[PDB]
Amino acid sequence: PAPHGGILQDLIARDALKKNELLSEAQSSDILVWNLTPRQLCDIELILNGGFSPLTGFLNENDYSSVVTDSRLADGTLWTIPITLDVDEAFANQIKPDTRIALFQDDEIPIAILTVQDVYKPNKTIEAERVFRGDPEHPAISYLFNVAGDYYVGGSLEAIQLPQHYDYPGLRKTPAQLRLEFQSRQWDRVVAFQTRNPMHRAHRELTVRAAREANAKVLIHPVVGLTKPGDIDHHTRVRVYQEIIKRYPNGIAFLSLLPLAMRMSGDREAVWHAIIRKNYGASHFIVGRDHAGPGKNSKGVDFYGPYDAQELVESYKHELDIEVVPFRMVTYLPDEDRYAPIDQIDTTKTRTLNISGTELRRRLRVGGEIPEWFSYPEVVKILRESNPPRPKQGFSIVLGNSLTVSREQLSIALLSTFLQFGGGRYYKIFEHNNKTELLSLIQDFIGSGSGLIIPDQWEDDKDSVVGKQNVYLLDTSSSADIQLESADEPISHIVQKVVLFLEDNGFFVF
């Protein structure tokens, strides 16, 4: 269909003949420079390549206010997520309307020149409530208060280049490029599938069925910009998508990566997704159950209703100009060796099988079997490599402050003891001396599968520097992961406590 607003705002194309000129200006000594943050880089790529058509810059207060309260740009164009350039006061103060500033990536690569229209301090309390529903635990609200700048700079953009990416050069198609890929294949009906997770057998099945019903080709369009905290890394996911696209009938599907920064904003995000896929050339779009939903908060309540997304999108159906295809999740029928829509089974007493996210996680943690009816083996293999089981995981044992036994001797005893076991894990007594440059390497060694023996705790104000995954405290305190009977417990007894704790937790298998 036609881009949202009618014209694809591909600014790279629009400004092609101004590239040298804009680059020189961006590099002039007198121009103010703002280094884009990771989320701003995702957003600016989508504005610059027309993925956010009709947007041609970051929203000034006029459009922003209208999006916050009315889900529309000031001119009435449907638009549910505010895209703004958030900066701190020190920068906002040296800015005024008409000022032209250079926007860089990594303080080295000029990306665009922004012509300032306005500078404002938005009420982040109202934004959180009106756009993200108010729950302080909502990923977007957490970001909005703890990470985002307090000042928004509205303005028009002129393109120099899209944010630099060295991985997957072939798969990161812009809207113009994707439309040409579809055109060269004579594809005029394409149904897009959104995802920020690995794809299992059920997803392959549901997308092929969607294609069959809409008489459309398939576009697997995963998000590789920012997704939900804790999600599988995009490199692992892309490997999974590259593997699964090979399981579709030849010529039915195309894989392209979307550098979007999701807000995990449920229904409003679903509408935003529909618009973006339309800009990218899709004729149809699948809106999932709890689409773009961040789950439940700490008290167990849903941030969004499971069908809020499908209902909001349905309310705007007459002006979206992209067909939404009903979501028919499928499940496996052992006795029939096939998959069927969950809305069509049971009631007649029919056996079904499924593996939840929690169960999948468990199996990967213990190195357990994962059935081919659930996920293609080549996909499972990829997931195991990126998320190895306990016998292959790294860890750290921290000698707590309470210890009065020799820390040097206890560290040496632990190292010598661990070196007896087979397995191939690399071990090291690691002294950080409370230095950030050393503390930040702890998770790097753990991520490499190594076992670190840390002779002393770091100061509390350094905690934030060390991730807590697989880090265990050996101490007398009740908070200790491995509790000592006493501060001067004999070294040989301490060693045994540690070895048995590690075995009980799967790090050692005998």
Which residues, 142 to 201, sit near Mg ion by CB under 5 A?
162-163, 165
Q: Cβ of residue 248: shortest distance to a second copy, in angstroms?
A: 6
3-state class of 183 per DSSP? helix
Question: Taking CB within 5 to 8 Å according to partner kind, which of Mg ion, a second copy, Ca ion, none is near residue 129?
Answer: none
* Binding partner of 150, given Na ion, Ca ion, a second copy, none, CB within 5-8 angstroms per partner class: Ca ion
CB of 20 to Ca ion, least distance (A): 19
250 binds, among Mg ion, Na ion, a second copy, none (CB under 5 to 8 A by kind): a second copy
Catalytic residues: 195-197
121 vs 235, beta carbon nearer Ca ion: 121
- The answer to whether 392 touches 470, Cβ cutoff 8 Å, is no
Residues binding Na ion: what is the number (CB under 5 A)? 4
Which helix H or strand E contains 338, and what residues bound it? strand 338-341
The answer on whether 194 is annotated among ligand-binding residues is yes
Q: Check whether 404 is labelled as a binding-site residue.
A: no
DSSP characters over 349-393:
----B---HHHHHHHHHHT----TTTS-HHHHHHHHHHS--GGG-
Beta bridge partner(s), residue 351: none
Which one of residues 10, 86, 267, 308 is an interface residue with Na ion (CB under 5 A)? 308
Smallest distance from the beta carbon of 301 to Ca ion, in angstroms?
8
Q: Residue 197 annotated as binding? A: yes
Q: Quick count: other Cβ atoms within 10 Å of Cβ 447?
A: 13
For Na ion, the binding residue among 76, 134, 305, 377 (CB under 5 A) is: 305
Q: Is 490 in the site for Na ion (CB under 5 A)?
A: no
* Residue 368 touches which of Na ion, Ca ion, a second copy, none (Cβ within 5-8 Å per kind): a second copy
Residue 250 is labelled as binding a ligand: no
CB of 108 to Na ion, least distance (A): 6
**C-alpha torsion sign, points 500, 504, 506, 510:** positive
Provide the minimum distance between the beta carbon of 370 and a second copy in the complex, in angstroms, as a whole number: 13
Shortest CB 491 distance to Ca ion, Å = 13
d(CA 88, CA 151): 6
Which of residues 8 and 42 has its CB atom nearest to a second copy in the complex?
A: 42
Closer residue to Na ion, CB minimum distance, 229 or 305: 305
What lies within 8 Å, CB to CB, of 406 at 6+ separation is 491
Determine the Cα–Cα distance for residues 251 and 341; give it in Å rounded to an integer. Answer: 24
CA 84 to chain centre: 19
Could you tell which of Mg ion, a second copy, Na ion, none binds residue 163, using a CB distance below 5 to 8 A set by kind?
A: Mg ion
Choice between 217 and 432, CB closer to Na ion: 432
DSSP structure string for 286-316: E--TTTT---B-TTS-BSS-TTHHHHHHHHT
Distance CA 202, CA 213 (A): 16
User: Does 201 show up as a binding residue in the annotation?
Assistant: no
In this structure, how many other beta carbons lie within 10 angstroms of the beta carbon of residue 319?
10
417 binds, among Mg ion, Na ion, a second copy, none (CB under 5 to 8 A by kind): a second copy
Please name the residue ranges forming H helices in 330-487.
Answer: 357-366, 377-386, 407-418, 436-439, 442-447
Task: Indicate the residue among 139 and 163 with the shorter CB distance to Mg ion.
Answer: 163
- Confirm whether residue 394 is marked as ligand binding: no
Residue 212 CB coordination number (10 Å): 10
CA dihedral over 81, 82, 85, 89, signed as positive or negative: negative
3-state SS assignment for residue 335: helix
Residues engaged in binding Ca ion (CB under 5 A): 150, 302, 488
Beta-strand relationship, 151-159 and 57-58: antiparallel
Give whichever of 310 and 450 is closer to Na ion, judged by the CB atom. 310
Q: Does 274 appear as a known binding residue?
A: no
- Residues that constitute the known binding site for sulfate: 194, 196, 292
- Residues that constitute the known binding site for ATP: 194-197, 288-291, 330
Would you tell me which residues interact with Na ion (CB under 5 A)? 107, 305, 308, 408
Would you tell me which residues interact with Mg ion (CB under 5 A)? 162-163, 165
- Residues that constitute the known binding site: 194-197, 288-292, 330
